[PDB]
Design a protein around this ligand. Sequence first.
Ligand SMILES: N#Cc1cn([C@@H]2O[C@H](COP(=O)(O)O)[C@@H](O)[C@H]2O)c(=O)[nH]c1=O
Ligand SMILES: N#Cc1cn([C@@H]2O[C@H](COP(=O)(O)O)[C@@H](O)[C@H]2O)c(=O)[nH]c1=O
Lengths: 257, 257
Amino acid sequence: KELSFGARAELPRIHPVASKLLRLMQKKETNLCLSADVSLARELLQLADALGPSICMLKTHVDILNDFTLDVMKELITLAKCHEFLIFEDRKFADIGNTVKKQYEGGIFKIASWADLVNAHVVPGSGVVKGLQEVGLPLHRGCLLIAEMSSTGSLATGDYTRAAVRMAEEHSEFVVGFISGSRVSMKPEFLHLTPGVQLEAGGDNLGQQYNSPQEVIGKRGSDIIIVGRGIISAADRLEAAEMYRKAAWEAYLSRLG
Amino acid sequence: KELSFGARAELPRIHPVASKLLRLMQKKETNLCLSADVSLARELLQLADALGPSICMLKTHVDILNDFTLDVMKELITLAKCHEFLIFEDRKFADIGNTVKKQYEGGIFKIASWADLVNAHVVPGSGVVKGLQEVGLPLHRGCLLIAEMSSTGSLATGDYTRAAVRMAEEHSEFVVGFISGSRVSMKPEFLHLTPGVQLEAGGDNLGQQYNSPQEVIGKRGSDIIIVGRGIISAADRLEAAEMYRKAAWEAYLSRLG
Ligand SMILES: N#Cc1cn([C@@H]2O[C@H](COP(=O)(O)O)[C@@H](O)[C@H]2O)c(=O)[nH]c1=O
Ligand SMILES: N#Cc1cn([C@@H]2O[C@H](COP(=O)(O)O)[C@@H](O)[C@H]2O)c(=O)[nH]c1=O
């Protein structure tokens, strides 16, 4: 039998970060992750504040911010704490452990100092996880492994996907779930987050593909939708975020029974 | 009968950036790329200056620099021009075209403004290249596709590797070669750059594997060695760079006949 988000938050093997996320999802009735792909700090913060109540998570690409400072991330954390959402930096770590460890802790972004969650490609082998966890475990953080991608021509299929699942299952002290297009693990202690979501069928001119919240949450068994342009390009971003939230939440309720 | 670097710099289908590189390799007698994995701008610049004459390329991870500014990059360009080497930002773009185009142009780093070369993972499908090339074409930049990786457990093998090669062939206007462990393309217009290189075989504690310049260039047919710790860990980095340069250059001559 499928467990609710609230119950999954209490599973014996749950990671504290996944448990925190699952409890706010249940509390707020939201399984929407806003993708805030914006070029200005003030836009990031404005959106986080206005849409915070509607979202379980805010996904950042800090490298696209023309005016990133750690004082912007400090302010973001205050918003995350106030509205109750996790911060997920979509950094896509994708190299040897020695390197990604430095990229996660160091440099100007100091990602581990503010990001509840990060993600990593599995193509380098498990060293990518072992390096990240050297930094993330002391900082009480979690990681998502990229098991499938939303884009046309994606190579993250078949045996590659199976490899991501195995790596996750063997690094549960740090890995809390997946970026995927569908449920890829049978263990309920893992989260599935799915980008490439819009209400209407389509894609963009550079390989993005879209499926609806009901397809991805209801039919494919994923837990959370990640939505950028579907919301950000809308005239009314508050109504758009509420529409995606209600769509994802109802799809989850249906699948739950 | 294999072509010299100087000869390849004249091939019909050769990219302008590959041509410039191959000519300076030939001129300077170096097929060494320094991986300057350091956290201080002052160290990066002192290395670029001292080692410039020994290297054909300097590989950066700007996100590890604690004191990155665009002015640091200005200086690095001045040294690249003065000593004649290319700047390769090892950014590992690895997402949908819409996102990578912004990561390449924008944000704090403005990578396209100073990097002659960048690399991309092929896992997202050809959209990753299509996005990057939209930014890099007017700027006369080039891209390397990651066909193989140096690390234990790497999933960049078999059909994954073949996909990277096909993608590179199909985007030869922008893609100038590969990050690989071995020659993966027969087309001499393509460069092969190989990390995971030290004089002493072995590895690190986080999945990195090392093979000799002789093995990599001489036996495996790659063009350029990418060397980080083997040089940067030495007390005298210039002596170390010369040791690697001679080893790689001679292994290349050996292969020629
Ligand atoms: N990993 C991963 C992925 C990340 N993303 C990211 O999710 C966001 C999708 O945004 P949008 O297409 O505007 O809804 C965007 O930031 C993109 O970089 C995917 O779209 N697909 C993936 O497979
Ligand atoms: N793509 C790629 C790769 C990049 N690298 C990069 O090359 C460098 C190797 O450094 P070192 O092991 O210190 O010689 C380091 O910056 C690492 O991130 C690999 O080692 N292997 C790869 O497959």
